[PDB]
Design an enzyme around this catalytic site. Structure first.
Site, short mmCIF file in Angstrom:
data_model
loop_
_atom_site.label_atom_id
_atom_site.label_comp_id
_atom_site.label_asym_id
_atom_site.label_seq_id
_atom_site.Cartn_x
_atom_site.Cartn_y
_atom_site.Cartn_z
N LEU A 78 2.16 1.61 -3.54
CA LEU A 78 1.05 2.03 -4.44
C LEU A 78 0.85 3.54 -4.25
O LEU A 78 0.68 4.25 -5.26
CB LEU A 78 -0.21 1.23 -4.10
CG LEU A 78 -0.56 1.13 -2.62
CD1 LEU A 78 -1.64 2.14 -2.25
CD2 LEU A 78 -1.03 -0.27 -2.27
N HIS A 79 0.91 4.00 -3.00
CA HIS A 79 0.79 5.42 -2.66
C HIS A 79 1.91 6.24 -3.28
O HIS A 79 1.67 7.31 -3.85
CB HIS A 79 0.77 5.58 -1.14
CG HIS A 79 1.29 6.90 -0.66
ND1 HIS A 79 0.64 8.09 -0.90
CD2 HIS A 79 2.40 7.21 0.04
CE1 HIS A 79 1.33 9.08 -0.36
NE2 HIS A 79 2.41 8.57 0.22
N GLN A 80 3.15 5.74 -3.18
CA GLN A 80 4.28 6.41 -3.81
C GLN A 80 4.15 6.39 -5.33
O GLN A 80 4.54 7.35 -6.00
CB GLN A 80 5.59 5.75 -3.38
CG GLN A 80 6.09 6.16 -2.00
CD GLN A 80 6.93 5.07 -1.34
OE1 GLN A 80 6.41 4.25 -0.57
NE2 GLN A 80 8.22 5.03 -1.66
N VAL A 112 1.62 9.23 -6.09
CA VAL A 112 2.22 10.57 -6.02
C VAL A 112 3.22 10.77 -7.15
O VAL A 112 3.44 11.89 -7.61
CB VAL A 112 2.84 10.85 -4.63
CG1 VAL A 112 1.88 10.53 -3.53
CG2 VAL A 112 4.18 10.16 -4.39
N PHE A 161 0.82 -1.20 0.00
CA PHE A 161 0.00 0.00 0.00
C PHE A 161 0.86 1.25 0.00
O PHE A 161 0.53 2.24 -0.66
CB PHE A 161 -0.93 -0.01 1.20
CG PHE A 161 -2.07 0.94 1.08
CD1 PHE A 161 -3.10 0.68 0.20
CD2 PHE A 161 -2.12 2.08 1.86
CE1 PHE A 161 -4.17 1.55 0.09
CE2 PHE A 161 -3.19 2.95 1.75
CZ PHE A 161 -4.21 2.69 0.87
#
Length: 187
Positions: A28-30, A33, A25
């Site tokens: 996926l977040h990086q 962004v 997660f």
RNA sequence: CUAAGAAAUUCACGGCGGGCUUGAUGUCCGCGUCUACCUGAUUCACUGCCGUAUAGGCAG
């Protein structure tokens, strides 16, 4: 967003599934962004609301070009041995629609006390008088644990799968893929 | 429906006087403790921001 891609954690003798889900997660977040936009939604198909467990699956909700871009981009580097994949395909229907939102709780009374001291110039004792220790609320919801890169903290990110609805609505998503207005098909 | 069924021990009191326990002594030779390991179970419920707010939201 009629396309989806399922990702299931392979069993690992080294790791528990929660650790792998949290690092997935975060990556996926990086990746989001790095990508930009608000069009990427996530879900947890094998959810357990009763035991507050995320399950062992994760599913991304986007258009097909986003799926084929994210299936080869280096945010999946080092996890392809930890992960087995599906194929970028169209969702089934009919499906109920629900929201996946980050819930935050006032979990530390002293931090809100220091905020009240910063915004009302009170002392520590006036902050303890105005804010007691009963205020601290603990959520009975599943969560991932995440390492911030701006600040240096490790915090639990509590997720809520919203109510099932017969129709979806427009909106965006945050950089974690969670709903700030968007909806996902739940199957 | 019980070896059933019942019951006021209590009033007072000076234990103190005195004393040399001593001498003497070789503990002692000998010894293989090895063997092999995930402290990680989400285990850091944190830091701040908007809001008058503790009511509620937001960021990483």
């Amino acid at each position: 967003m009629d396309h989806y891609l399922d990702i299931r954690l392979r069993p690992d003798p080294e790791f528990p599934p929660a650790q792998l889900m949290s690092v997935l997660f975060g990556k996926l977040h990086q990746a989001l962004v790095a990508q930009g936009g608000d069009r990427i939604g996530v879900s947890f198909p094998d959810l357990d609301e009763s035991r507050s467990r995320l399950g062992e699956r994760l599913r991304i909700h986007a258009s097909a070009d986003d799926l084929r871009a994210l299936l080869a981009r280096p945010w999946l580097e080092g996890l392809r041995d930890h992960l087995q994949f599906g194929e970028p395909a169209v969702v089934p229907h009919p499906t109920p629609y629900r929201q996946v939102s980050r819930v935050q709780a006032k979990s530390n009374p002293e931090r809100l006390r220091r905020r009240l001291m910063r915004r009302h110039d009170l002392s520590e004792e006036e902050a303890r008088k105005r804010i007691p220790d009963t205020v601290a609320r603990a959520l009975d919801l599943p969560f991932v644990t995440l390492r911030s890169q701006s600040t240096g903290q490790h915090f639990r990110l509590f997720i809520r799968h919203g109510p099932l609805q017969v129709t979806a609505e427009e909106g965006g998503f945050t950089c974690y893929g969670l709903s700030k207005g968007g909806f996902v098909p739940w199957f």
